[PDB]
Amino acid sequence: AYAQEKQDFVQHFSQIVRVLTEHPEIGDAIARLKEVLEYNTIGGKYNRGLTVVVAFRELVEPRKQDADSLQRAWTVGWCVELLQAFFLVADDIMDSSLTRRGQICWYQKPGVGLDAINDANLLEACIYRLLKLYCREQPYYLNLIELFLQSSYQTEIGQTLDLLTAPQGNVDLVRFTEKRYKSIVKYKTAFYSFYLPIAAAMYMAGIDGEKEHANAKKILLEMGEFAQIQDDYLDLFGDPSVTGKIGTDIQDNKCSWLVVQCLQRATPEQYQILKENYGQKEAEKVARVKALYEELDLPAVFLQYEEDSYSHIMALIEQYAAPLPPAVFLGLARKIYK
């Protein structure tokens, strides 16, 4: 389980920071990297990184879980957390967000600003530094490099689809379709958040078969679709004290699950209300959209969807888990379905 390993995982971060921040000439730049790592890779729930560690423990025979192999698993879990930190620092600039993980976004900090672009790229570079230091002699080293590089390309293509569908200052209700939505979230979130951590543990355990990885992907990309729908729902209806951040999807004209569901149910009067108020900074326009979503009972539509989704994901675990332990996927379902 995760809940137990959260403190244990977090305890390994100080060694990750020490190995990355140990040529005195670059000293000031290494001090800045330490500040970027400390600010941006801590404060989250660490679900993606913990997934690597728990899945590795469940997939590798305990007699093979020696100290060095376990250290490699913790390090690769932290690599997944560094990839997410890279995407979030940059996403927060592109989405004009204000807070993340209970504090001001890194780019909004006085003295940081758009220098955060380079800081995000340093976080991504740290992944490959750690893989070389800890994993270069292992038979799965190239599989992991390619998996992290593919996950980044996937995510970036999905970010392009997200940003193209959400132009600033242009109405884009015509592209807020279920088909467009499923394509955005599959690429921007599902691959790196669900497939990547389990696939990394699979490769570290010697499970490199195409069929085995395709079957796990069938479960995991559907779980990732639900995780992004829940993120969209919480952007507006979650409590920032719990989520750690303030939502921006309506002001940012995003193809959110909520707006997709709104358009499917709206009358022509409601469609016009959404056209006139969506995608704009004015607080009273944002409030009108939320009031429309409440008039259409979209919170009840989301709860029903969550139930139907959970049943679908469990049916996929029954179809596709074997020969992996079903616990690998059940523990991940427990973290996302609250």
Place this chain on the structure above:
Amino acid sequence: AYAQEKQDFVQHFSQIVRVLTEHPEIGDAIARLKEVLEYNTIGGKYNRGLTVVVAFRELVEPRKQDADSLQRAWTVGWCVELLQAFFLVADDIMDSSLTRRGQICWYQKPGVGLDAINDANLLEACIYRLLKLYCREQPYYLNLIELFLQSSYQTEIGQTLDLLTAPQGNVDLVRFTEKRYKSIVKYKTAFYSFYLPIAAAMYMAGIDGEKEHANAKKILLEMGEFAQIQDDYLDLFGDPSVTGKIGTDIQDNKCSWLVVQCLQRATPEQYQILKENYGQKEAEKVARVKALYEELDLPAVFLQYEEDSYSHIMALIEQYAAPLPPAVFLGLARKIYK
């Protein structure tokens, strides 16, 4: 030679774009990637990419230069041009630049803005897409992946040093030292612009020895230091019709070679003039700094430096080229020393 291969190299770009932009769901995002590739990876001199191709031709026996091997060399040269495009798109946002390669910077284009952050990352992702498609079965594949990843980390650490030394709105004359300068440019420019293209050709030719790569690096990082000093000089004294871009180093408070040389020669009255006018947006303050640099004959100091640098780099070619053909380094010296 380069001058001949410029059109031949450019002719391969259409196949690079076709293989990268060939799942209809992501179609709109792939169309945007094609626009980012067309806008940002064309218009330059292609010196870094051509260096890969010319060095490969000079290092590999002609009987081994079959069509497929030559295609791999063109593709890896284009990978170096994609790395430079990634760094330049992001650098232009962080340096608040206006033009590049004779047109408005990508981020300044109406409708692009900070979405250019994700576009820059897509350019970097394309490198690894091409290396996998064209080079995965080759014995040097992992050497090239690691070389591109190291070059990126080097460059990003140097960008951190550049940005830290150049705070907006704070005087930083105390850190504009020759020692700080040499450290910034070695990491931000010399590794990716000079070592990377020659080292990539070396690995493709089977030259993977640590000693051979260290000796080439001794020449190439010094040539890269001169290339950044020339870039700094041209930021203020070059003609934008020739350089393709407008300089921003004085307004951006940069640790430019020019300001370093100014501080070494300044009287106390001149130091105060530079303190009051450097690092600020006002056009009349920028003009005062340029007038001070002219009073101190910094253009003549740069020409003398260029002569002394060229003699030093040629002495290093005599010391360290062997057993590589000296032409590999002489052709690169000819491109940078005008």
